[PDB]
Amino acid sequence: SWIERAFYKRECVHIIPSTKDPHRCCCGRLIGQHVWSISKHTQLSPTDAFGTIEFQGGGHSNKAMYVRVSFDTKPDLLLHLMTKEWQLELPKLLISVHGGLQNFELQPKLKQVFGKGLIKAAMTTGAWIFTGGVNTGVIRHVGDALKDHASKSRGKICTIGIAPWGIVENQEDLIGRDVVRPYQTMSNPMSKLTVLNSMHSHFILADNGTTGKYGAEVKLRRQLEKHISLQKINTRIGQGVPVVALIVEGGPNVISIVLEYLRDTPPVPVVVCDGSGRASDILAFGHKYSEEGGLINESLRDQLLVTIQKTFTYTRTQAQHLFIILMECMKKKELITVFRMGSEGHQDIDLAILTALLKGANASAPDQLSLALAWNRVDI
């Protein structure tokens, strides 16, 4: 009963602007299906969609808690919810997985190694995995990784995913107050809305009022990660919890996400993967051909411009703007760790991730030793 009295929600009560399709409003819902304040005029109310989800189908049966939360809420209430009501201890590591919202396929060896790395990293350190919530792309690969982990050995990987509330399929099926609601894994290929990932543990649904549109969760997730990182770890030597940012594929937005991670106090290290394609591959080609950070000569600059304009199908000025964003990222070249399949790129995800965390903290060796003691990683 505390969840209804502490967390709030918002619903679309607007003037119904038609724009393109007369039934589709500014929030995208049907014209008769109604019942920020700019053009949506939304009203605030206690929540009516929280509790537990029983994922019917999809092989293994897994129960995942969920709560619908307004997008402008304060992280201490949400962090208190996870620590008290969900009985989750404070993690020794936070992992932020970002990627492309479109579905993609990787190499089988790359997918297997990335999945085994993410599973082992979230097991040994007792970490929290932050995904996009819905079962698209990189979160689908994380879901297949969680299939494997569970299928092979026991373990409760805390994998809190943050998704927009209005874009999940069967929103009426998840309506209740502290009630277990069945959910269907079937995703209609005709419907633009996508289902939630079946192999997750907790879900911070973020309603901005709109349906069928993204952007209702990025600011809340970023401020929650910041509020988590300002919490001190249990070693009490003078450090907060470490935050890493794993990037697989991605689009044009993940370069700005990387720039927001790098140009932050304290800075957050970024680990990328190679072979997936798109923004990760252009980041890798920037990282190998970089010399002294931002000192990039003309020929690889033109190569980067033509590969951006070819892979992302952008214009000349858009590729130029993305190249300035790439150079602004590339000023802080020491924080990026690039994992490469084969070669001498540590041959594993987890040495790259934990080494990136150790030099992203950049503190004294007592602080690194206390971090390794908290993670129970003697080999690292």
Binding site: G57, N103, T185, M186
Partner: protein, 48 residues
Amino acid sequence: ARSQIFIYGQQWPVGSLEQAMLDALVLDRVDFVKLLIENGVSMHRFLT
């Protein structure tokens, strides 16, 4: 059937998977039942 028919990007008619489950159950195909449960068929909504 796993590698080809249940590949990614496969469009499915409504009610066809439930008829496929009914055919798999009567023809003692335990591996095909396991495949269909893993591909989203729920027994609660199928069994009448």
